[PDB]
Design a binder for this molecule. Structure first.
Ligand code: RBF
Ligand code: RBF
Ligand code: RBF
Lengths: 258, 258, 258
């Protein structure tokens, strides 16, 4: 909307359109957490807090009127800036097919780690708890290709004592996955037809259920690009967003110690 | 709605209808603050916080990604209980026209002071500031019937240096008003045709403008009555509500020191 | 119109609309002269002089061809600048209801004295004469509440020896009006049903007739706001206007000496 002052920057339609496509491609492969959690739809640029449904009592013991306060979670807002070069950007109109956009890509890669760190390890100043802190759901595994199958078979018998079902997914580390490569068809069918995700963000493995409604991400505004000011022969732009995160049912998650 | 468990109490329609009318009459004359402020419509039993439109920065000085948190005001919830007598309540069906309801009236009178205290003096634990703490809007007055007219004429020349207009109202203490009784027609027309409100809640006088949009009260749920449990030969009931308060433009208010 | 370069400033529609309303309110109460004089409609941004209907002869005494020049009044143009803060202005989109606009109000108050000074005391370099320089229309008054009524009754017998009639108005000083407060209904009906105006711009009183067509103010362009240039993190704006003033019939004015 209008709060991103896009019409006041000296660029053309083709130049604006060439900048969005490059960032949309990297955001699609570098956001690992968004592949197995739920997303609650956007509320707007004015939303500020999300309700927790409880009261805390502050009055004394022997009083006629008694009172307290309600509870909530506050959202987080971010902002990051970069700069580009005008004479280099202007060859697109003469007809050059490969213009150099190298400052955009480093910033796009650094913004993507900030969100995954909050999802996997919490914040401690906004009141958020991450996935790797629930230490009461753990089983010890070994380091031979048979132990992987044995641990996967043992993990589905704990989901049964509760009423948990649905498709199941494996999330594992990319250096560990190299030494288990000979057994790939066996795992997929022992998982009853699930899927595997490799990532550099953790050091061990975890198993989750995907029936729906256990891990949610709340958004106010999605990721956006805007204009700030002009310099000698460069231009200055920024990226922004607002969000928060929550875990509801901790019985759909299991950690593998290795 | 259903969260007040009214259908599970052993009473009839006439008995329920006779209890609401008595409280509705006292609430209409004992709520003094609601006669010159604005009321924002009810949102519901789940509303929890109201937005302040600002951000607070928490990151360090030299970083690539910078962040902060948004700001809000939390609401207040109250609850008060009382008890009544069944054999006495049952004479309404035999045809008695004056049944004794004496425990209801003390509780109704004590709930009404709690709200006026917040409006006139703040809370200090929810982050609320009341009307009598803005000390930069004050003028000294005297104690002779001419000084009242002189101070009222002086107070309308300060409203003019800003763009403030509209009808004006006087709020004064009831023991002070006794000694100014001979001049009543003069005040009403010197006020350009305003109105006067006497109250036991303060000790001096104040003047306010009533053009609209300067002092607001935000409600989640209005004042309601519900049922709790049964005892030997009595029944137990309660009253409840949720709210908060704000002052926007401090240039529509003036205090008279006397 | 287009000579105010409004489209080149980095603001939104709501931000522009919030700035006009605040100035429109103060201009409505701080322009005292415009309450009893006439206004001749606007001519445009190119108007330059207004005709006086006379000729001045410059040739010699014994010549066959004789000649001279015509006479006029030139208009006055003004300009005043101020600056504002962008991050503070940007909270209106997050939802803040009271944004601080403190530099605008001082400039608006200082522009309003400049016009009243010309109307009440003349210019001496454009050829303008003000209301307080016609010294042949004066009567001496006293300082007791009866002398006010006596002087008002005497002043209406001078309007009768000429053919002057119509409603009559009193313009008086605000510290003097305090000591005459007990007689207010008497004055209004002795004035035959007129009106009273209090002001801090003079030191005595005057009486004028309001039949129409004796004191006129000529405008080229009304009061307007425009954009100049951008700074580090602020923006710079200005206010402008063009006008002149004239008195036609000096027999509709009387001064009270006190
Ligand atoms: C032939 C020629 C073409 C140029 N084209 C551009 C251009 O497309 N964009 C640009 O910013 N500067 C261009 N410049 C340079 C630019 O005019 C100048 O060096 C700086 O903008 C400072 O005046 C060009 C210079 C020359 C000699
Ligand atoms: C003639 C009579 C009428 C009564 N009516 C009522 C009544 O309307 N409501 C009531 O709670 N108790 C009533 N009681 C008393 C009640 O039955 C009893 O004392 C207590 O409820 C304990 O059993 C009545 C008792 C008598 C003797
Ligand atoms: C979270 C955050 C939000 C900001 N929002 C704004 C803004 O709305 N307008 C603004 O001019 N500057 C804003 N700034 C600061 C701005 O980017 C920077 O300090 C100066 O504009 C110089 O780069 C913000 C900074 C942070 C950290």
């Amino acid at each position: 909307m209008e709060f991103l002052k896009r019409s006041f920057a000296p660029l053309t339609e083709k130049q604006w359109q060439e900048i969005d496509n490059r960032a949309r491609e990297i955001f699609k492969t570098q956001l690992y957490g968004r592949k197995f959690v739920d997303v609650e739809g956007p509320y707007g640029w004015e939303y500020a807090a999300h309700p927790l449904g409880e009261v805390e009592v502050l009055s004394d013991e022997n009083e006629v009127v008694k009172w307290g306060l309600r509870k909530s979670l506050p959202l987080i807002e971010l902002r990051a800036t970069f700069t580009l070069d005008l004479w280099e950007l202007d060859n697109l109109e003469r007809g050059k097919p490969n213009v150099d956009l190298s400052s955009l890509e480093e910033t796009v890669r650094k913004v993507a780690e900030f969100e995954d760190e909050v999802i996997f390890r919490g914040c401690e100043k906004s009141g958020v708890k991450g996935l790797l802190s629930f230490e009461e759901r753990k089983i010890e595994c070994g380091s031979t290709p048979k132990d992987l199958l044995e641990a996967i078979v043992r993990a589905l018998s704990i989901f049964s004592k509760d009423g948990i079902e649905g498709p199941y997914t494996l999330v594992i580390n990319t250096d560990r996955w190299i030494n288990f490569l000979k057994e790939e068809k066996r795992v997929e069918e022992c998982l009853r037809g699930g899927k595997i995700i490799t990532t550099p963000r953790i050091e061990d493995a975890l198993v989750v259920s995907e029936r729906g409604g256990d891990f949610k991400l709340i958004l106010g505004q999605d990721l956006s690009i805007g204009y700030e000011d002009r310099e000698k022969d460069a231009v200055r732009l920024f990226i922004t967003e607002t969000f928060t995160f929550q875990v509801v049912n901790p019985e759909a998650l299991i950690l593998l110690k290795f």
